[PDB]
């Protein structure tokens, strides 16, 4: 069991973007240039659109791995501000201390 249904949908989005990465790379290359005929570029613009929407990598959201919080996350640890503060304030993070200066 994952934290919630929102984390489950995101997990699937992350596994389908990995599957279609090479495909979306090879096809999208045909569009990001000025060297190929515009007829081919307009057609490659439609092959990329036909791929499933969950393959698109801009639909991935970074959520807290432990609470599935969408915002407030720190990317180095993948934890929300609330969860990070609980581990940090108890001496459980290696080298993290309070900042006094």
């Amino acid at each position: 069991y994952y934290v919630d249904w929102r984390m489950l949908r995101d997990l699937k989005r992350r596994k389908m973007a990995y599957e279609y990465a090479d495909e979306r790379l090879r096809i999208n290359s045909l569009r990001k240039n000025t060297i190929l005929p515009k007829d081919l570029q307009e057609m490659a613009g439609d092959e990329i659109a036909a791929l499933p929407r969950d393959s698109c990598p801009v639909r991935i959201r970074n959520r807290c791995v432990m609470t599935s919080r969408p915002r407030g996350v720190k990317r180095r640890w993948r934890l929300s501000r609330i969860v990070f503060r609980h581990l940090a304030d108890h001496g459980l993070l290696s080298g993290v201390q309070r900042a006094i200066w």
Partner: protein, 140 residues
């Protein structure tokens, strides 16, 4: 042991090859840690080990780095109230000189295996070799 002592302890086999050895003009060892005292003890252990093996060593302290970030203290609203956290990184650089490749492997193995917890190393070997045989002679 007072009376019971090993007689002829078995020692590993070290076989000299026929390949020429690497020649390191310099070998910089940058250790990092959150704790200065650990760096002092590791510096003492490493400098003593180098002097005991005949290696030439010098030590300096690169400037420390402190990374600070701010967070929201409350779980809900109360924006103006924050909590700040920092991680401190301290450095000790062990600059070795004029090392063969056999001396640099045994020394690095010995000191890397004894690297305390919370300490990261960044070895920067600088090898010196002759010129390529093709480059030595211009050929058209």
């Amino acid at each position: 042991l007072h009376v019971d002592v090993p007689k002829d302890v078995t020692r590993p086999t070290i076989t000299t090859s026929d390949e020429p050895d690497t020649l390191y003009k310099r070998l910089s060892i940058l250790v990092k840690a959150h704790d200065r005292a650990v760096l002092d003890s590791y510096e003492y252990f490493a400098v003593l080990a180098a002097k005991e093996l005949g290696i030439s060593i010098k030590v300096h302290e690169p400037p420390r780095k402190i990374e600070r970030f701010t967070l929201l203290k409350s779980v809900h609203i109360f924006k103006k109230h924050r909590v700040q956290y920092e991680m401190r990184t301290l450095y000790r650089c062990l600059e070795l000189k004029h090392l063969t490749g056999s001396t640099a492997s045994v020394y690095l193995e010995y000191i890397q295996r004894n690297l305390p917890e919370g300490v990261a190393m960044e070895v920067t070997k600088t090898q010196i070799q002759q010129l390529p045989e093709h480059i030595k002679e211009p050929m058209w």
